[PDB]
Design a protein around this ligand. Structure first.
Ligand SMILES: Nc1ccn([C@@H]2O[C@H](COP(=O)(O)O)[C@@H](O)[C@H]2O)c(=O)n1
Ligand SMILES: Nc1ccn([C@@H]2O[C@H](COP(=O)(O)O)[C@@H](O)[C@H]2O)c(=O)n1
Ligand SMILES: O=C(O)[C@@]1(O)C[C@@H](O)[C@@H](O)[C@@H]([C@H](O)CO)O1
Ligand SMILES: O=C(O)[C@@]1(O)C[C@@H](O)[C@@H](O)[C@@H]([C@H](O)CO)O1
Ligand SMILES: [Cl-]
Ligand SMILES: [Cl-]
Ligand code: NA
Ligand code: NA
Lengths: 397, 397
């Protein structure tokens, strides 16, 4: 079975920070799952004091494809809970800075956490032997160390850079790390000779686009801002922040030529009278107004690349290696590998059969084949032939 | 004469970042000054492309007490300019991150900068021997190293934490460092036995208040946000940021009990629907609505302390040592020393006679006496008697 690690520590002030993934795995479960989480995930449902959370909004639930769980849905699974006493102790060891504590959680081993994880996993006979893989929504060396000791893999699974409603939902699934420490570039370098894609970058974009593209004033430079306390601005940012990204761009452009888009999820917006502030209804319309795009490691950087815009990527991220290739054909081949083999159809990373498939480490050809089968499900070979044919069927339907 | 160091490097994207201090020293000058700066400070006046800067707004000029300089005003002084080629090289050595480059400038020696400074100071005979002291608006180990070699002191001078129109204008003057690395606590520990002030914290506040206090709904916790790229959020913050300060407070209070005030100077404001956002006309009205106040190292933390509010200070700053005393009488005595001896009447830090006075390192009693003489100028002893009498004359006039 699966062992799904969803830490309860409220590093950013919100209880059950990864609730949506708990609900998604519960809703998709065709077998019993082991959940390694906190009591907050179990007690938020009934609380009826948190019920205004976005995870309970039927529009969010529809976009992500889940329904709230019932006593019946939850009874099928096993739950291990981590205590908060360790969280308070963790904060005490990082000058009571919750964000620095989160950084340590993401990037360093925490031996006291490893001990509690080991204890929980040993709390009942047979729990460990029935674990086929761990799953984590973020990097966590503590868990990854525990997994080595036990001989288990760790799939790092997260929502991907292309999301509904603009795009088909995608997910990350990476055995080495998610956002930071990823294996996308390594996987591509191993199979790059198998990719001969007869499509442009914009064609790859159009395959994943689920809406009519927005209507076509240009700004020399577009600046993508991110959520200030998302893990990849804490740990994988190469020290850059929204404010230093802005300063970076100002070294190269006068303010009249800068267009800044705040992240709709950020707690902060921009003051109305310094820069030109983007007000597009989505990030695609924003980047279409820009001649070149600057980002730390936002998902929007991938959108910029795929629409052919000169993009600067200052942080670490899964897609950066696409942008570091010289040839136009090489960039397309890398993008095609990224989109059809590295990224996973979102629902499949919650499907136990697909997860067991990936746990066998199959060939890139088989992975691409299973993804295209899912993407083609409602439609009326080698690897390139599969991708080329898939693009062509969208070409005329 | 004075040697006034005003670096031209646009770490935050703005040319001549310390223009106001250039104009203030020029306007107040009763003798020839040596300016160590950049061409941008000399070429911004006529540029008439920057003229919308706040340094040119007559209301700002009045608040800070200066007028724009003329060809005549500037002719009296000597100017050494630093080249930009070093700035571009500096950026190249810190991953092209201007904010990290600014951090290095503030906190580390930069040997190539020391060489250019030495070269400029040697560029004309007799320049060095006529320097009585350096002045810098910020910490700069490069300059401070040069000064040691040459046998010169470095006065660190900056606008203070109490400013017009709410308060009498104050300034910092610190031989060791401004904001970070300050000598306020050290100076107080040396003279603490001389302070026996028969006044409350609120009385000290009222002495510096220049307006009728705002009219008296309370929030359990007020959160002071700062300018995201001010030096003391870059270098003296103990790694805290606005966003981690907010997370810190959320570990202790639910959002309904938090009141957040953005810095009017910040480029960012808060989204309207997460926290309760303060909209007070000034920071005093904001802290009056709060039962306890949280800050990294804002000037507003001093206001909170002086109005008697429980204050948490997470970064390094000049006033923190006041907040770390236990006794109510000890806190008043430290505050009185801070306000009357450490802080300087703003205009005096631009007055060459006062600067030569301080360069003699006089006793705390003489310093307090000169400050009270300035504050008392428009009014119709030992150290405590001077401060007590000064407070009492405000008591009835
Ligand atoms: N400045 C920004 C950053 C992100 N976003 C939206 O958020 C999604 C995820 O972006 P991050 O990877 O930046 O969190 C993007 O696909 C886009 O839809 C935006 O619309 N404007
Ligand atoms: N959150 C904040 C921070 C500062 N301020 C104003 O800015 C001045 C300087 O504050 P900093 O030291 O935070 O830059 C304060 O005296 C206050 O007048 C404010 O009004 N609200
Ligand atoms: O919340 C985070 O830690 C982050 C993780 C990223 O993978 C990404 O999901 C990001 C969201 O896009 C922010 O809205 O948040
Ligand atoms: O601009 C900065 O680097 C800072 C320095 C601090 O001393 C303080 O002056 C602060 C201003 O109050 C920000 O408005 O800016
Ligand atoms: Cl799909
Ligand atoms: Cl005064
Ligand atoms: Na499509
Ligand atoms: Na007064």
């Amino acid at each position: 079975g699966l062992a799904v690690f969803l830490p309860p520590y409220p590093f950013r002030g919100l209880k059950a920070p990864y609730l949506w993934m708990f609900y998604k795995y519960l809703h998709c479960a065709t077998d019993s799952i082991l959940f390694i989480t906190g009591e907050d995930y179990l007690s938020v449902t009934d609380d009826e004091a948190q019920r205004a959370r976005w995870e309970f909004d039927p529009a969010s639930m529809a976009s992500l494809g889940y329904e709230l769980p019932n006593a019946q849905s939850m009874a099928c699974h096993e739950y291990l809970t981590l205590d908060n006493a360790f969280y308070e102790t963790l904060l005490s060891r990082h000058h009571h800075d919750p964000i620095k504590s989160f950084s340590a959680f993401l990037t360093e081993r925490i031996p006291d956490l490893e001990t509690e994880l080991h204890a929980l996993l040993d709390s009942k006979k047979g729990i460990i032997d029935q674990i086929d893989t761990f799953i984590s929504i973020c990097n966590c060396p503590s868990l990854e160390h525990v997994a080595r000791t036990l001989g288990k893999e760790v799939m790092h699974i997260e929502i991907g850079p292309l999301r509904a409603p603009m795009y088909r939902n995608t997910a990350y699934l990476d055995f080495a790390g998610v956002n930071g420490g990823t294996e996308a570039s390594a996987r591509y370098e191993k199979c790059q000779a198998e990719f001969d894609i007869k499509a442009s970058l914009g064609d790859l974009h159009n395959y994943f686009l689920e809406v009519l593209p927005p209507a076509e004033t240009h700004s020399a430079a577009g600046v993508v801002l991110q959520v200030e306390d998302c893990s990849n601005l804490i740990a994988y940012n190469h020290d850059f922040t929204n404010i230093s990204l802005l300063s970076y761009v100002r070294q190269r452009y006068e303010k009249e030529d800068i267009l800044v888009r705040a992240h709709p999820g950020s707690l902060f917006r921009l003051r109305d009278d310094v820069f030109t502030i983007d007000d597009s209804a989505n990030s695609l319309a924003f980047i279409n107004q820009c001649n070149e795009v600057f980002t730390i490691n936002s998902s929007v950087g991938l959108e910029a690349i795929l629409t052919g815009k000169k993009t600067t990527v200052l942080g670490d991220c899964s897609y950066a290696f696409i942008n570091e290739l010289a040839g136009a054909s090489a960039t397309v081949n890398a993008a095609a590998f990224y989109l059809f083999s590295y990224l996973v159809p979102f629902d499949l990373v919650f499907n136990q059969e697909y997860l067991k498939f990936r746990l066998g480490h199959p060939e890139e050809r088989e992975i691409v084949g299973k993804h295209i089968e899912f993407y083609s499900a409602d439609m009326p070979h080698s690897l390139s032939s599969l991708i080329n044919e898939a693009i062509s069927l969208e070409h005329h339907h």
